[PDB]
Amino acid sequence: SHMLKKGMTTVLDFHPGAGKTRRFLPQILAECARRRLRTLVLAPTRVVLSEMKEAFHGLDVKFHTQAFSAHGSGREVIDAMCHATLTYRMLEPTRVVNWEVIIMDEAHFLDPASIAARGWAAHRARANESATILMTATPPGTSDEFPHSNGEIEDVQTDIPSEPWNTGHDWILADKRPTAWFLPSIRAANVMAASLRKAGKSVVVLNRKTFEKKPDFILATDIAEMGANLCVERVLDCRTAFKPVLVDEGRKVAIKGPLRISASSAAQRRGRIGRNPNRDGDSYYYSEPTSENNAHHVCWLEASMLLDNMEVRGGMVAPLYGVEGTKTPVSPGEMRLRDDQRKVFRELVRNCDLPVWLSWQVAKAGLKTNDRKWCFEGPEEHEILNDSGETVKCRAPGGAKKPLRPRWCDERVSSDQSALSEFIKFAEGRR
Secondary structure (H helix, E strand, C coil): CCCCCCCEEECCCCCCCCHHHHHHHHHHHHHHHHHCCCCEECCCCCHHHHHHHHHHCCCHHHEEECCCCCCCCCCEEEEEEEEEHHHHHCCCCCCCCCCCCECCCCCCCHHHHHHHHHHHHHHHHHHCCCCEECCCCCCCCCCCCCCCCCCCCCEEEEECCCCCCCCCCCCHCCCCCCEEEEEECHHHHHHHHHHHHHCCEEEEECCCCCCCCCCCCCECCCCCCCCCCCCCCEEECCCEEEEEEECCCEEEEEEEEECCCHHHHHHHCCCCCCCCCCCEEEEEEEEECCCCCCCCCCCHHHHHHHHCCCCCHHHHCCCCCCHHHHHCCCCCCCCCCHHHHHHHHHHHHHHCCCHHHHHHHHHHCCCCCCCCCCHHCCHHHHCECCCEEEEEEEECCCCCCCCCCCCEHHHHHHHCCCHHHHHHHHCCCCC
């Protein structure tokens, strides 16, 4: 009952779908307001932040949806924003904000900003600067694939096709319950969607786009676009995902997969159903076993790169949160850059949309943001290829047509057509 006392760290493991964000969060925020405690509420995704806008109606909460770039109030004792928004502000060598309470909703996402934000909030509590609350049924350290739920779930281990099929999986279409299906890639999802619609099902494919209704199938590669309103009674889970992974003794980022997911990721997929205590028998179907063996995944190093450069009172060094500190290949502080390098790192990630790992390499080499020569100076083994297996050439600085051969190789800049044309636009200056 001292959840709001400076120095306390509290993990609140509510069952999913039980008004933790439409019941608990509003009430704890009202208490923070009554105590006049400067409070920060953090969301992992725009979907969650948008939901918070709806749940907090009535409360006086300042949302920062675009950027966090001023200090003040006017009854706004509470700020709400996404992790990246917090990260971008904290990457400037500028003014520490004295939040006394930090509340992290859905505190289980594994993107680098979410991981770094957990380490940062944990540090503020250990420094006695804040009370920190993490809300999630799968906090860092857990590895239960089948945790508690409001309503009883039927778990079924079975073969699940990852491509359209002509025989042998009759159970899938015969069940008419609204279904969410996690597939390993957007390509696979699009291909499955086309097929299911040929089979007379309604299908929605969730992806990052512009848009955001009870279809037979919702297909997705992860839980990022799934909000509180998801209307589903059955989940099929391929239990695999492609991941950017550090290879060649940490010299390169390669995209590998499909790889097995962690127990808690599988639990969060399963946790889309069983949310209604009045409805028993939601079903979770899965095939592949999970794996915790993911310490070579680049997210952990990227989180470290972010956290080591997030401005903290006293400039203290801080580790990732709990067991996550065990995942990163570096010691706390080792990725800290100096101020000028930090400004470059920040602009590359925030404004040029380069991956964190790659941006750190550029910054650490002491190169400027507008200096694009590195894109052409790597060796032949760093040559980028298009979708038909040909060398990519574009306009290097000075205008000359040169093989795209970055000094540092991060396969996320060339993984598909969209990424490649963006990387080329970057390499060419802006044209």
